Symmetry: C4
Subunit: 326 residues, 4 copies
Amino acid sequence: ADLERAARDVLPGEIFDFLAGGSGTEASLVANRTALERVFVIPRMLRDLTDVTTEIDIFGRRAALPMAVAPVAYQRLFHPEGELAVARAARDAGVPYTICTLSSVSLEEIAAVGGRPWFQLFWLRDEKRSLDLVRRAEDAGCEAIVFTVDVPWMGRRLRDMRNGFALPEWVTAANFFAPATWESVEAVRAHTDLPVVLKGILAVEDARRAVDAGAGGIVVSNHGGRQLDGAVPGIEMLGEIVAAVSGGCEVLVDGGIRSGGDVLKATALGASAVLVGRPVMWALAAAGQDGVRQLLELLAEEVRDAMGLAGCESVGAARRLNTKLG
Amino acid sequence: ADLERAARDVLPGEIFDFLAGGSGTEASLVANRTALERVFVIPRMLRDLTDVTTEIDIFGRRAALPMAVAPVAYQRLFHPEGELAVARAARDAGVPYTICTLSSVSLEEIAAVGGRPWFQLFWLRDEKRSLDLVRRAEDAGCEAIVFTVDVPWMGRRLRDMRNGFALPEWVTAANFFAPATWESVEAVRAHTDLPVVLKGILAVEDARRAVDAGAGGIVVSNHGGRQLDGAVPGIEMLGEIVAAVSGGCEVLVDGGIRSGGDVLKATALGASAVLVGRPVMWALAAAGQDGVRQLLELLAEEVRDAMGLAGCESVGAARRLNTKLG
Amino acid sequence: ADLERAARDVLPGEIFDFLAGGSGTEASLVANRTALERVFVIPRMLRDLTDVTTEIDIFGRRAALPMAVAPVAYQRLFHPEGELAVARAARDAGVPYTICTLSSVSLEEIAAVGGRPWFQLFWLRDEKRSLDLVRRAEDAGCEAIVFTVDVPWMGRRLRDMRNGFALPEWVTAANFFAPATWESVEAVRAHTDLPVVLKGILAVEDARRAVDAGAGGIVVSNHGGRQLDGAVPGIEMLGEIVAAVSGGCEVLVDGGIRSGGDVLKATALGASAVLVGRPVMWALAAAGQDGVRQLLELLAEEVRDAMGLAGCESVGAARRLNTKLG
Amino acid sequence: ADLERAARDVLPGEIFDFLAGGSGTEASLVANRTALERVFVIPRMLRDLTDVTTEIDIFGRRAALPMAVAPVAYQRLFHPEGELAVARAARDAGVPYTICTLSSVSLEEIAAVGGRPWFQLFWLRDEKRSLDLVRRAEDAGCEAIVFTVDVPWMGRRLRDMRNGFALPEWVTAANFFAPATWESVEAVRAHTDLPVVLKGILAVEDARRAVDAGAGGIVVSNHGGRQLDGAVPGIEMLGEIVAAVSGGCEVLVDGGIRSGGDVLKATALGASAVLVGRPVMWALAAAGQDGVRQLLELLAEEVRDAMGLAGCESVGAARRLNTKLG
Ligand SMILES: Cc1cc2cc3c(=O)[nH]c(=O)nc-3n(C[C@H](O)[C@H](O)[C@H](O)COP(=O)(O)O)c2cc1C
Ligand SMILES: Cc1cc2cc3c(=O)[nH]c(=O)nc-3n(C[C@H](O)[C@H](O)[C@H](O)COP(=O)(O)O)c2cc1C
Ligand SMILES: Cc1cc2cc3c(=O)[nH]c(=O)nc-3n(C[C@H](O)[C@H](O)[C@H](O)COP(=O)(O)O)c2cc1C
Ligand SMILES: Cc1cc2cc3c(=O)[nH]c(=O)nc-3n(C[C@H](O)[C@H](O)[C@H](O)COP(=O)(O)O)c2cc1C
Ligand SMILES: O=C(O)C(=O)c1ccccc1
Ligand SMILES: O=C(O)C(=O)c1ccccc1
Ligand SMILES: O=C(O)C(=O)c1ccccc1
Ligand SMILES: O=C(O)C(=O)c1ccccc1
Ligand SMILES: [Mg+2]
Ligand SMILES: [Mg+2]
Ligand SMILES: [Mg+2]
Ligand SMILES: [Mg+2]
C-alpha cells in the first residue's frame, strides 16, 4: 500500500518479479484488482458506534482484524529475518500468520514466536510424509491446517522463466510433491483435530463438497493469479459461494486486498476474513519487522475507519452491508 | 465548469488539494463523475415551451433553479470574503445557500445577507450545544436544518495527509464533535419547526427510515467522495430511493454536478433538486462574488437550455423524463 | 471516411469546428459513435446472392441505397458550389438529398438539379410563412417534408462560442423562428400531400404519437450530438421504436454513420434507411462535386459488400438480421 | 505467441499486413481478442489427474490436442518451404492440418507428408470443377472437407488496398469462384463419404440447418475478422450454437486463439476443438518447420497445464467447466 515502491527500490529485480508476477498473460492477476474496483459499498448511517470493534472469532480464537497473513513461500528472499520478522509483527498485531510448507525458516521456529500460527500444507508424494508434516504443525501449536488445493503443480510464471529465476543458495526449504485429491483431504481430516481449511476453491460445487468433506473453512482464491491464467477472481465467486454453504464453514477470500476499504468490500460480499499476501512482503522488504508492523497498523486503522463510516459496529454488521457493481 | 483552471492558478496547491480531494484512493470521487456520464436522457419533442420555468418550491419557499449551494467548510480558504461573497451571489441568483457549522464567518453574519439560507449541522459532543446551534440558526432566519449524517468522523483524505495540511491561522471556525445517531435526529426534529434534511443517505432503508423519522428531505450523497472510499455514488441510488419514499420527503442529490445537463439528468432520475459544491468554490477562488454570480448565471442558462431541448416546461416535467444507461 | 483529414487540411479551423462540433461536453456526439461500435451483426451464410440489390422504395420513389444526405445548413461554407455540388452528386448516385431551410443556395435552384430532393423545414414565427415555405418546396418538386422537431432553439455549441464563429458575409440564408409543437405538425400535414417526416424523435411515445399524427416517417436522431448534450443516441432507441410503430411509418436513423457496415447495422436494428451528414460535407470540402460522388460510390460499394457478406440479397433481408451487443 | 515480433522482423511489411490484417476498420479482428479476454474459467479442484490426456477423437481419427491448423492461403509467402514445413510440423505434433484450395504447394504434395490432412474448399464457378477438387482431396487421403461458407466474395482488406498488395510472381495457386449456397453444400455431401465441415457459421439457425444438411461439423468463425467487418466473434456465439445442435455435429471455433488457456476457454464454452491461424504463420515465418514444431509444443504444454490446473483429466471434462464473463 505505497510501500510497493520502496520494495521495488531495494529488491533485486528478479526477486521483485517472483513476488509481483502471475501466470501466463497475468489476466487473473489484473482481474483480482479490477474486480474489487467494480464493487461499491452501500453504507448505513446513524447507527451506534460507541464500541466499534474489528475483532472476529475464527477457528476457536479471537483475531484483532478480519485478516490473516497469506502463505507466501521463502520469505528470506525479501529480508534476512524472513518469516520470523513477519510472524513477530503479526503476533503483535493480533493477526494470524500462515506458516508455509516451503518456509525458509522451520515451522517449529516460526511457531515458537507465538501468536496464532496456522500451517499451509502442500501434499507430498507420500501420504505418510504429508501427515507427518501435519503432525509437526499440530505438535508445534498451529491452530489450523490451510490445505492448498489449487496447485496440482505450479503454474507457468513467465516472468520467472524470462528471468531464469532460481532460489539463491542462501535460501532453502527449511522444513525438509503430488497432486492433492479429495482422498487427500479426507486423510488429513481423519488425522487431525485442527480445522482443515481448503485454500483455492472457486467453483460453488467445490465449496459445497468442502463442507460435506468436513472442512472448517475455505479460501475463495485464484492463488493471486499465479495458477490458472484465466481463472475467475475469488471476489467474483464469493457471494455465490457464501450463499451455497449457508454457514456450514468459514468462507475467506484473497487476491488483491490492498486497503481497509477492500477488506470492507470482501466482508460486505460475505467473507468471514481475508488473506493478504504481496503487501505484507512489500512491508517486509522495505523495513523488516517494523515495516510489517506499520503495514498492519495502517490496515487496522483503515478497517476501523471504513467500518464506522459504513455504520458497522462489528464485522458481523459489515457482512450485512449491501453492494452495487459499478 | 472550466473555472477550475483559474482556481488552480490562484490557490496554494495544498488548499486546491483540500478542495479537490477525496478519501482513500479517490474511487468514490471519480465514480461520481463516471456515474453521471453513463446516464443519457430520452428527450421529448414538440411540447409547449411558451412559459419554460426552472423554478421550484422547496421547504416552503420558491427557488429560482432546482439547485442549492452545498455546505463547504472554511470558505475564507478560497477568497478573503469567503462565505459572504458566496451567500450574496446565491441570494442574487435566487439559489439557497447552505451555511456550514464550520463556516469561517459566523452564521448570523451570513444569514444577514438575506436570500434563502439553510444551515448544515454537525452533531456536537453535547445534545445541549447541538440544539443551541440549531436554535441560533432558526433565530437567524435559516429555513432548513441540513443535518450531515455521513460523518461519524472525518474520512482519511490522503492529499491533506501528504501535504500536512492545516488551517491557516487567519481562518477559524467562526461559529465557536460526536457521531450522530437516529436519537440525535429525533432530538433535532423535536426542537425545531424547520424541515430537517438528512444529508449523506445512500441505503434505501435509511431513506425510508428518514421519512418515518419525520425528515422533510434527504440528500442522497457520498459526501463528494470524501467520506467512505468505495461508497456508491448517490446518483446510482437515487432512482431506487425516490421510488421507496414515494413522495414522503424531498429527495436531493449531490456529487459531481458540473452542468445544467447534469442537473437535468438528476431531475430525470427523480431528484427534487441538486447541491453543487466544488464548482462554487472554484468560482469564488477565481473571481469572488462576481465569479460565483457568473457561475450561477451560466448554470441557470444551461438548465433552461437542457430543459427546453428535452421538451420540459417545468422541473416536474423533467422528473417524468426517462433515461437510458450507456 | 478518411476524407476527414483532407477537409481539415483545407477548411478554416472555425468552419471545421462548426461542422465537427457538438453541444456542451460533446457527450452525445461521441456516444453516436460508441453506440454503433458496440453493435455486432450476426451474418447469415449460403443464401442466393445472384441478384443482390441495395435499392429501396421510400416515400413513393426508388432510391439506389438505403441512405439520404442529411440536412446540413450553409454548404457554401465548405465549397464555393455548396448545395449544388452535393445535390448533383446525390442525383447522379440515386440518393435523396435533403434541402435545408437554411441553405446557402435557394431551394428552387437546388430542386432544379433534379434527382429526389426532400425539403427540411424549421418552423418560423408565423404559421403562414412556415406553410409558404412548405408550398414553395412542394411547387419545386420536393418529395417529402423533413420537419426538424428537436430544435425549439439551437443548442449550445461551445466550439463556436470559443471561436466567436459567425457566418462570413459571402454566405447567406438564400431562402429568405419559433418552437414547433404538435399543432405545427398538424398544420403542415393538413397543408401538403407530401409525406411529413419528423426528424429528431428519440422517445418511444413520441414515435407512436408521430404515427397517430399522420407522419409518413420519422428520423430517430439526437441531431448529431448538436442539440441536447446527454441525449441518447438514436441508434440505441431504434429497435424499441421500430417495434412500437410496427410498420405504421418509415423509421430512419442518423448519427455517426461512417461506412457501409454502419448502414448494415442500422438496417439490422430495423431502420428503413439512414441519413449521412458530416461525411458528405468532408467530401464536399475536399473535392467538391467529384468528392461527394466518390464518397457515395465508396458507400455504395461498402453497403453491397456488407449485405452480401451477411447473406442479404435485399435491404428487407438485412432488416431481418439479428445483432449482439459487445 | 511472442513469435509475432520475429515474424514482423523478417517479413516484408506488406506480407506481414496481408497476414495480420482484417476487413474494414478491423473491429471484428480486435473483437475476437476482446471477447476471449472477457471469459474467465471457474476451475475445479482435487480431481484425479493421474492420466491427464489432451487427446480427442474427431472425424474418425485421434488428434493429440483439441486443435487443428486453420486454412491460410499461400504459405510460401511466409517461408520458402510454405505448406510443406507446416504440414510436417503438424504431422509430427499429432495435429490436423487444413490444406487450402489456394495453397502454394499442390494438395497432393502436402497430403503426401502424411499426418491427418483436411481439405478446405472454396466453391468454384462450376459445380463440376468444385466436385473434382473434392475428389482430388479424397483420393489423396484427406479426412474431412472444410467447406468455407463465409466468402461469397473476399472482404475489403484496407491494409492490402493501401499497400497495393499482390501475389509475388514466385507464389502461385498450385492446385490450378462463385458464391456457395445450401445447394452447393448438398452437392458436396452427395459426392463424398468424408465429413463435410462448414467453416464460417455464426447464426444459430445456420448451425441447426448445417446439422439438418448432413454436416459432420461446423467452425463457428468470423474468418479472423477478414470478411464482414462488424461480424460477431465466433466465441460469443459458441455457447448458444453448442446448445442448439445438442450433439448433432462437432462444433469447432476459431478467431484469436493465442494460448492453451484460450483453448481451455473455448472448450469450456463447448467447442470440440479450435483452429489456429495467424500464430502458426508467425512460427513459420520466424523459423520454418522447426518454428512451427516449437509453437505446437508450447501450445501442447499450455493446454495440458491449463486443463490440469482446472481439474480436467480429459477434454470432455473441460467442456463441462463453467465460465463467468468479466
Ligand atoms: C510469491 C508468492 C508465493 C506464494 C506461495 C504460496 C504457497 O506456497 N502456498 C499457497 O497456498 N499460496 C501461495 N501464494 C499465494 C498467496 O497465499 C495468496 O493466495 C496470494 O498472494 C493472495 O493474493 P495477494 O494478497 O498477494 O494479492 C504465494 C503468493 C506469492 C505472491
Ligand atoms: C472542501 C469541502 C468541504 C466540505 C465540508 C462539508 C461539511 O462541512 N459538511 C457537509 O455536510 N459537507 C461538506 N462537504 C461536501 C459537500 O457538501 C458536497 O456533498 C460535495 O462537495 C458535493 O459534491 P461536489 O459538487 O463537490 O462534487 C464538503 C466538500 C468539500 C469539497
Ligand atoms: C454543420 C451541421 C449543420 C446542421 C444543420 C441542420 C439543420 O439545419 N437542420 C437539421 O434538421 N439538421 C441539421 N444538422 C444535423 C444533421 O441533419 C444530422 O442529424 C447529423 O449531422 C447526423 O449526423 P452525422 O452523420 O453528421 O453524424 C446539421 C448538422 C451539422 C453537422
Ligand atoms: C492470411 C490469411 C489467409 C486466410 C485464407 C483463408 C482461406 O483461404 N480459407 C479459409 O477458410 N480461411 C482463411 N483464413 C481464415 C483462417 O482459416 C482462420 O479463420 C482465421 O485466421 C482464424 O483466426 P486466427 O487464429 O488467425 O485469429 C485466412 C486467414 C489469414 C490470416
Ligand atoms: O505457490 C506459489 O504461488 C508460488 O509462487 C510458489 C513458488 C515456489 C514454491 C512455492 C510456492
Ligand atoms: O466534511 C468535509 O468533507 C470536509 O472536508 C471538512 C473538513 C474539515 C472540516 C469540516 C469539513
Ligand atoms: O441545426 C444545426 O445543428 C446547426 O448547426 C445549424 C446552425 C445554424 C443554422 C442552422 C442549423
Ligand atoms: O480467405 C482469406 O481471408 C484470405 O485472406 C485470402 C486471400 C486471398 C486468397 C484466399 C484467401
Ligand atoms: Mg489479498
Ligand atoms: Mg454536486
Ligand atoms: Mg449519420
Ligand atoms: Mg484462432
